[PDB]
Amino acid sequence: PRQVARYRTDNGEEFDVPFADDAEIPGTWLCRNGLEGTLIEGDVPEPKKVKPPRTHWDMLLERRSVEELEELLKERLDLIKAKRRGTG
Amino acid sequence: VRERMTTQDVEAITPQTLINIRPVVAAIKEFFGTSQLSQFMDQNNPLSGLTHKRRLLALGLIGSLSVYARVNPFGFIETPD
Amino acid sequence: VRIGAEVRDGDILVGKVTPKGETELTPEERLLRAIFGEKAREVRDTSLKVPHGESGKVIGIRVFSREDDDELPAGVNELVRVYVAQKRKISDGDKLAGRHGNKGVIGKILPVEDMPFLPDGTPVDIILNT
Amino acid sequence: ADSVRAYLKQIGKVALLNAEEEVELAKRIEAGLYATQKLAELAEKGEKLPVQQRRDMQWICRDGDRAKNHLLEANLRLVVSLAKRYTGRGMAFLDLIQEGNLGLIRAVEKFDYTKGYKFSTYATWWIRQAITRAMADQARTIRIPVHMVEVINKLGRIQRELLQDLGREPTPEELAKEMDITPEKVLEIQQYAREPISLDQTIGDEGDSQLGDFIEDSEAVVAVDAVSFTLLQDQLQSVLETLSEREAGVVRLRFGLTDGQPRTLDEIGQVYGVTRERIRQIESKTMSKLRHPSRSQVLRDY
DNA sequence: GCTTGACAAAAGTGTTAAATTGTGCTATACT
DNA sequence: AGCACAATTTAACACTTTTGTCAAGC
């Protein structure tokens, strides 16, 4: 007594996962491939509030205020503009 | 100790903090066990235990000592003066 | 086991038990459980039995319990050692030997009667081949 | 042919940075990071910039990473210098070095050139922490969370400092008192700290038989039982032939001999179309019938 | 032979508090 | 090392639905 569900990985490979009939099938399944797969059924409800990992920009921003950065860029840009024709 | 006495500011160093005696005790406990020289005393009769003591070893390899043999201070066999 | 008791092969020396679960007992096992009314216990038997081919009397017991005193290593809560000893009659098959390197198995043990005996009627103990 | 003597041969190629250079490279990294973010933010804001200035900022980014990689490649010696001290603790040297290089990477991302401290001052923290944190996560075959590795090491020092104070190894109570935890807790901790042994290790001691082949598989089928179990099934089947048809069906379903699944009284009554109470009443009469000596004496031995 | 209701133990189920666990971080200088 | 904090697991408990039982009765 079992119902079969299919899951599609990102690469396109499909996997058959036999479940029991009286239970609720998941929408994503850790497959033999090692990659998450999405059911080809109607739901497929949710992505489960994935959170963004911390990036180098996050670390920089929380020490320099955006004004300090703008001035440093002006320093750098005025430095660049020195070689465009400017000084020789 | 060298790593301990080098890694710090100074004047906080005491002999105890500088020395964990773990390597000393470990080497001794690790010698009596898991060593070819240290062996369980063979004793099914007083003779066996007596000859287990006085047995000599080499890294022909195994032999026992002479009756009147008397080792010298360093460990040079002296035979009877 | 009580001191001075006689123990054969497979007898129980110390009775010990360890937790067990989930049991998930077979249906044919439980049906008898209900018929005879013996509740399936929640723990499995881990009891010390005398090894196969050993027998003797129990000399002494050494019990070490965590309850009172007794520095037993982390995890251990109690220890008991059983000492068994046996008189070993010289048996056919054992090994004898003299101080000159001669050794052999006891091939047979003949009744004192049918033994080569001196004119005294003094039977000889052992017979060595030439 | 050694692997590490090669890595050392390559990192030394780069020239260390003086105090002034660290600041210069650090500037280029922050400028490039913001310039890159500024461009990406405009598309969201639906804004545009001077075409010429836009190409300038685009080059700023390219220049920032060169400083980012140059800054890393210059300080690799620092990672190795700290990695030396942690060898033999259960992690290979190279692993400690790479993990240290990961800390070095974060030191660069979080370094602040405006504070005026030499780079090695702030990099040692991240490099050190990276190596240690790695060991707690990887060094043990059975991974132990960091907080537990932390307490185990503290229990070790408390035990070492207490060892030197009392001239004897302190018991759980002292160790517990000095550490402000229950002795039963320090016992649970000392079990966690155990490290496994090698099955491939040879314990023959004259015979060269490894430890592995000495373990008794306890789940393996007992030869006599699987047969006596098949004989019990047969004995039960025959014993049921004495009961009524409806009667045998109930006892089977209640214990699940036929379908391997026990059933509640309600479930059994639903298949027979009767109340759940009656099902209970049936079982009782048939347990006392099965308790009749004729059917039982055979089963007691089983 | 069977069903009803009262009823208590038992097993689920949802809601919260506690604990465990994982990640970030430490600024003299140190290659 | 050591701590802070967030994220997640585990416990705890109330409360609800089940499941087994009783006495009395159709």
From Swiss-Prot, chain A:
Share an example GO biological-process annotation for this protein. response to antibiotic
Protein's UniProt keywords contain Transcription regulation: yes
Copy out the induction comment: Constitutively expressed during growth, increases slightly in stationary phase (at protein level).
**What Gene Ontology terms describe what this protein does at the molecular function level?**
bacterial-type RNA polymerase core enzyme binding
Q: Which UniProt keywords apply?
A: Antibiotic resistance, Transcription, Transcription regulation
**Of which family is this protein a member?**
Belongs to the RNA polymerase-binding protein RbpA family.
What binding partners and quaternary form does the record give? Answer: Monomer. Forms a complex with the RNAP catalytic core, specifically with the beta subunit (RpoB); its binding site may overlap with that of Rif. May bind free principal sigma factors.
Describe the function of this protein. Binds to RNA polymerase (RNAP), probably stimulating transcriptions from principal, but not alternative sigma factor promoters. Partially restores transcription in the presence of rifampicin (Rif) in vitro; overexpression leads to an increase in the Rif tolerance in vivo, with smaller colonies. Seems to act by removing Rif from its binding site and preventing its further binding. No longer stimulates transcription in Rif-resistant RNA polymerase (with mutations in rpoB).
Q: What is this protein called?
A: RNA polymerase-binding protein RbpA
Native source organism of the sequence: Mycolicibacterium smegmatis (strain ATCC 700084 / mc(2)155)
Lineage, top ranks = Bacteria, Bacillati, Actinomycetota, Actinomycetes, Mycobacteriales
Q: Which residues of the full protein are shown?
A: 26 to 113 of 114
UniProtKB/Swiss-Prot annotation, chain C:
Its job: DNA-dependent RNA polymerase catalyzes the transcription of DNA into RNA using the four ribonucleoside triphosphates as substrates. This subunit often mutates to generate rifampicin (Rif) resistance. Interaction with RbpA partially restores Rif-inhibited transcription; once the subunit is Rif-resistant however RbpA no longer stimulates transcription.
Extent of the signal sequence:
none
Q: What else is known?
A: Mutations in the RRDR sequence (residues 423-449) confer rifampicin (Rif) resistance. Rif blocks transcription initiation but not elongation.
Q: How does it assemble?
A: The RNAP catalytic core consists of 2 alpha, 1 beta, 1 beta' and 1 omega subunit. When a sigma factor is associated with the core the holoenzyme is formed, which can initiate transcription. Interacts with RbpA, which partially restores Rif-inhibited transcription.
Q: Can you say what this protein is called?
A: DNA-directed RNA polymerase subunit beta
**Covered range within the whole protein?**
781 to 910 of 1169
Family, according to the entry, reads as follows: Belongs to the RNA polymerase beta chain family.
The gene that this protein is the product of is: rpoB
